[PDB]
Structure 1
């Protein structure tokens, strides 16, 4: 049997009771990550299907503990809000988009995260298909492409997310969104098999050079694709 009311009331009402009498702030920050990691580990083993009543109070409490904390490695704080956001995806309530996307900025600034930043940054454009806010897209590929070109971020599926990044700006924009997007996919056929690149890579390799501005980029951008042996094999080479 488990009521979980007294359980959430003990920790929910007793957080710094031992830290209020000790006037010497020890600022341990060493076993706190292990304690919070143990809490999210036990709640991770009891998070799938146990009881639907206490989970909303536990989650609504820990997401407030994210704001009340203000000092963490910003790993578990993102873990609870993304494992809650995944539930909110199929739950049908998109009102939390301002919460996850508003707190994501706080959860991505103040620390050095290389691998977790890309694995957790997909939430910026995940619910954007349901939100479709133009100003939000203007704030967040701006906040997305701050400092990252190739390095310090490895997965394998990198090109897939690359296609998943600026295609929504192509949905918001009209033509200029792919001018800088379709010009950087030349390394995509080198990473994976070139069999399927004829339909997507070698097809989008001409859209950005046709839709390029007629002032200066048309003069020099036409020389980057010239010389490739696969260019003449396309029937559109005459076009």
Structure 2
């Protein structure tokens, strides 16, 4: 339905699958279903339902073997949500999780862009104790290297 150049009625159908209670194999298939519910919600711009559905996931699970692309898309979707909402420190934290993902560590740009956006989203937050702590943590981090006219 979503492929069929029509989306207003796309989110509705899939926003009826409680893969939490459907009683399936393990936390792979249902994580995928929840994430596609979320993707459809973002596509239709239903941010309240986006947050509510995202609350169904437990990020602690993503410390597992195959849990790489699923958590990557999880954080990317949360980041779309927050970017259209207005928060910036939350977007910082989400990019930080993306960067800390072991797979994301590999390949040059897959971490260079992550750190670029992490630093900008630290900078684009209000001056609070939390923002100051994040500024300190991202400060240098060794790997921040001397990205030209950037770490300065």
Same fold (TM over 0.5): yes
Cα distance change on mapping 1:105 and 1:155 into 2, 3 Å: same
| Structure 1 contact 97–127 (Cα < 8 Å) conserved | yes
User: How far apart are residue 128 of structure 1 and its match?
Assistant: 2.4
Greater relative contact order, per chain length (Cα 8 Å cut-off, separation 6+): 2
Structure 1 residues 10-29: aligned runs within 5 Å: none
- How many equivalent pairs are there? 152
Q: Which has the larger radius of gyration?
A: 1
Cα separation, partners in 2 of 1:231 and 1:195, compared to 1, 3 Å: same
Q: Measure the CA separation in 2 of the matches of 1:159 and 1:129.
A: 16
Q: Deviations over 1:138-192 (max 9, x none)?
A: 3223233465442375355643553244223312335344032122233246545
For residues 17-47 of structure 1, give each alpha carbon's deviation from its aligned partner in whole angstroms, at most 9, with x where no partner exists.
xxxxxxxxxxxxxxxxxxxxxxxxxxxxxxx
Q: Aligned equivalents of 1:112 and 1:211: distance in 2?
A: 42
What is the DSSP-based 3-state SS (H/G/I as helix, E as strand, rest coil) of the residue aligned with 2:61? coil
2:42·2:80 contact (CA, 8 Å) conserved in 1?
no
User: How far apart in 1 are the matches of 2:19 and 2:76?
Assistant: 26
Counterpart among 74, 78, 91 of residue 4 in structure 2: 91
Query: What is the aligned counterpart of 2:25 among 112, 119, 134?
Result: 112
Mapped contact 2:2–2:10 kept (Cα < 8 A) = no
Shift of residue 116 of structure 1? 0.8
Q: Provide structure 1 residue ranges, at least 5 long, that are not aligned to the other structure.
A: 1-87
Indicate conservation of the 8 Å contact 1:182/1:207, yes or no: no
What is the CA-CA distance between 1:107 and the residue it aligns to? Answer: 5.8
TM-score normalised by structure 2 residue count: 0.71
CA-based RMSD: 3.3
In 1, Cα distance between the equivalents of 2:41 and 2:131?
33
Q: 1:134 to 1:161 in 2, by over 3 A?
A: closer
Gaps of 5+ in 2: none
TM-score computed with the length of structure 1 as normaliser: 0.50
Q: What does residue range 156-171 of structure 1 map to in structure 2 within 5 Å?
A: 156=69, 158-171=71-84
- C-alpha distance in 1, partners of 2:65/2:107? 25
